[PDB]
Symmetry: D2
Subunit: 266 residues, 4 copies
């Protein structure tokens, strides 16, 4: 009669998988992912930090761009994550096997990462990736220092329970630049109200809008660059149109309020 | 010359290790731990639930009291935890090996449980126990239903990041009894202010006082019975002097404020 | 230019995904998987045992067939595995979430299961599935007893390092039937000689042929029924043509020797 | 009446905890543990390797001796283990937190390490330590190369299921020196015959005697130096009396045969 369906691969728009050469953000910060997925390399005298890696199949491209930047596999010391979904943490397990890198994440992100994104609160097992273990668990507001660059965690639960913004200060033209890598504030296909797997979802999102609003934020970057109005293919104008953290938070709250209203009506 | 010190066992007052027979709290809820450590057995038509197990060496005593209550190892379905320290989650790994029980806990409690309490934010490796894995991760406000009894999680971070109050409604003399098993609100030897491993410690405690204040709470129990003024050795008057959740929260906040002041002066 | 390739789903022949009603093997043993993937239900007075579950998408079908057999989710006590690949252990994580079942496996199978089949010695990350934790680690020759039925583990490393045969005695027409569930002895696309990830691969396979040869084996079953010449769609003649364990081992060794010769020439 | 007993710390002879300065074994290999517990530092141009760390409380001493040798925490790349008991793998978790080091171990050692030595086949929970995760799983005969030094794993199951000998070639006075770090072959208090948790214990020990016999072995070292007749306190004559691998294997088999006979009589 009728067999069970085949497994369906997690497929994405081609631009999410389009390799790009390293794009400099500030003196020591580079976008090294693809056109439409962020993966940030921060280079220090004492080794390199990677914030996100994009999709699972991006590992070799990431290592190629690191090499181009002067970063060997031994030189990658630390991987940080916005959140532990397949399109942002996808290649973490493989990067750990192929480099010196250790992962630091909050408890929520660590337990989702360790199950490869399976049993997702909203997606079930539809969007899985190779599991990885965290080496260090961070608390809200905790700092991690690499080669003199200080990264601060700001929890902003919602898109996932463990969603995190990471902030650090780089330089450019001799001046300090406070970079805010703010996580996703979307809720794609989520049941927002009365969700038994996430009862306080709405409150957490609202607190997260306020957290993002208030971040130290000369420059905002986001895991999907379009959410902060970056265009990584636009070269010297890639960041010209970028949103402030205040504007990003406001746009995400407006969208969220619309989704709530549509869910009540739907 | 001078060898490194021997490992120091986690030792406790004798009353914490003094076995007691099952003490009935309500129609289906029993204290089955020791005189000075709580371990709550909730019996349903559909299997039994255990909330905490006390110290690591209490596993066999717990199983003996379960048998006395009509609960075989196969009948224990679920273990819930106040928090994942050695004096409350100690025997969880062994109970999982010896019974049908699965563990449900929040992400913070799950990652501390999986490392056997090692790398504690405050105690280091001084207070470890056999590690165990959680089978289900719960979110704040999530419910779990066993044999018709509904348990609700209320996160109350502070004593540990994953500290949780568990609430359920039992009966007694035909009437409903709203039981609140509220976690510890102590901070024994903790650095409260400017703690790099827990930057928002003070805020979390203050929110946790408010959470405990507001719990549905005809009857309060606590992992250390003395914190809620229970005397498990007093038989028919064991619970007579018990605090309300409001009074427990207020006393813990008063103590916490004193500790803050002493830390500033110390 | 050219994006990175999309992720490729693990796809299989339709017959591997074709549901079938429970097929009785002996008094208490049933095939409950699909036409071309084995999943064995063994029913005891003291709960049920499942040996393999097939592909990840088979979980609900398995639970439907268990219900048909009188086995509720609470009644499933134990999951055993031939080996921890996606086409045999696929639905284990979900079954653990949805039933009372605990997993017993050897250390090799446990560490592959816990990484969802990623970083496979031969397949890399091409064939992954939701990760699951083992509850009990078994040693070679160890027995596990459920409701009076005694299961014995026989390690037969090769297809995976943790490949295992499981044996037990059922009954049929008042007589004992020694059932041998022997794991795969294939090496699909494997580098056999000088493999840096499995240096003693050839020796392990040869020992495994001898192990399978000698199993207590009135009736042989295999994870892919065609390997033991079962036809689960043939009803009352499904097992008529089944191989002996001796014949299965001999055929697998003949095939393996051919593959070795072809690899030397290739 | 009578409380349950206090937890009993894992205590050891003082000499096992007596710090010593680094003792050179060959051009790039040093003993850096205590008088009576081995911890081997192998220094390469490309970072350092540690084989065992001794007891849990030795972490800081190990890092002090590494510093004395020119090895900063960032420089420690790899930790290898003889076996995952508290007196040899004790400080691994803490070393991972405090250094760049990643752990490579076989599956058996990895699952015992991840449970901090709890649920030991012979010791139960009497001898536990902080749990740690392996970063790489090795197979029998697999090699790992650091800064040009090639380490080969030789499984020698018995003392634990995951017991391993590690071999590598160093130099001394311009000549190659084949170093064999052979694991323990003792069975302290073990039930050898008919052990339900280790049915093939005797066969594994006998195969392990043969494995040790045949190792490439200009110089033998062992986790307890006295087992190979090393005296780390004897300075320039520390290794003068050391056994060959053949003699070590023979002495261990003689002892094992005596223990078998005594167990039959006991
Ligand atoms: C698995 C899903 O989380 C992802 C997907 O659809 O593939 C995207 N992630 C997003 C994020 O915000 O991380 C949402 C955004 C990206 C552009 C459209 O909405 S949708
Ligand atoms: C490891 C420590 O957390 C425990 C200990 O000292 O053994 C106690 N736990 C307490 C709790 O509140 O859980 C504190 C209370 C109990 C009575 C004195 O303060 S102290
Ligand atoms: C991921 C692979 O392991 C599986 C696959 O190709 O999908 C099959 N498993 C087999 C086994 O023996 O488990 C091999 C057999 C089945 C029929 C052809 O060879 S191939
Ligand atoms: C937990 C136990 O494994 C250890 C102990 O007793 O503390 C020792 N380990 C040994 C080994 O061989 O690793 C045995 C040896 C050392 C000297 C006496 O027998 S005894
Ligand atoms: Zn610079
Ligand atoms: Zn996402
Ligand atoms: Zn996304
Ligand atoms: Zn009742
Ligand atoms: Zn505590
Ligand atoms: Zn306590
Ligand atoms: Zn029958
Ligand atoms: Zn397979
Ligand atoms: Zn297969
Ligand atoms: Zn040299
Ligand atoms: Zn040992
Ligand atoms: Zn030892």
């Amino acid at each position: 009669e009728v067999p069970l369906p085949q497994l369906r691969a997690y497929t994405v728009d081609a631009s999410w998988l389009q390799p790009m050469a390293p794009l400099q953000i500030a003196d020591h910060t580079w976008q090294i992912g693809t056109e439409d997925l962020t993966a940030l390399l921060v280079q220090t005298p004492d080794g390199a930090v990677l914030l996100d890696g994009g999709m699972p199949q991006m590992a070799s491209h990431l290592l190629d761009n690191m090499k181009a930047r002067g970063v060997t596999p031994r030189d990658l010391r630390l991987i940080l994550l916005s959140h532990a979904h397949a399109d942002h943490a996808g290649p973490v397990a493989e990067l750990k096997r192929r480099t010196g890198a250790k992962v630091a994440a909050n408890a929520e992100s660590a337990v989702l990462l360790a199950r490869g994104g399976s049993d997702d609160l909203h997606f079930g097992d539809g969007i899985t990736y190779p599991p990885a273990n965290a080496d260090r668990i961070v608390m809200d507001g905790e700092v991690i220092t690499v080669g003199g660059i200080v990264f601060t965690a700001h929890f902003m639960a919602g898109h996932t329970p463990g969603s995190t913004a990471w902030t650090w200060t780089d330089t450019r033209n001799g001046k300090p630049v406070r970079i805010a890598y703010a996580d996703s504030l979307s809720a794609p296909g989520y049941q927002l109200q009365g969700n038994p797997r996430y009862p306080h979802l709405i409150e957490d999102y609202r607190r997260s809008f306020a957290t993002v609003r208030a971040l130290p934020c000369d420059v905002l970057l986001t895991p999907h660059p379009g959410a902060s109005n970056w265009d990584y293919a636009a070269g010297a104008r890639a960041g010209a149109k970028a949103l402030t953290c205040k504007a990003y938070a406001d746009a995400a709250e407006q969208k969220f309020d619309g989704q709530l209203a549509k869910e009540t009506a739907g």
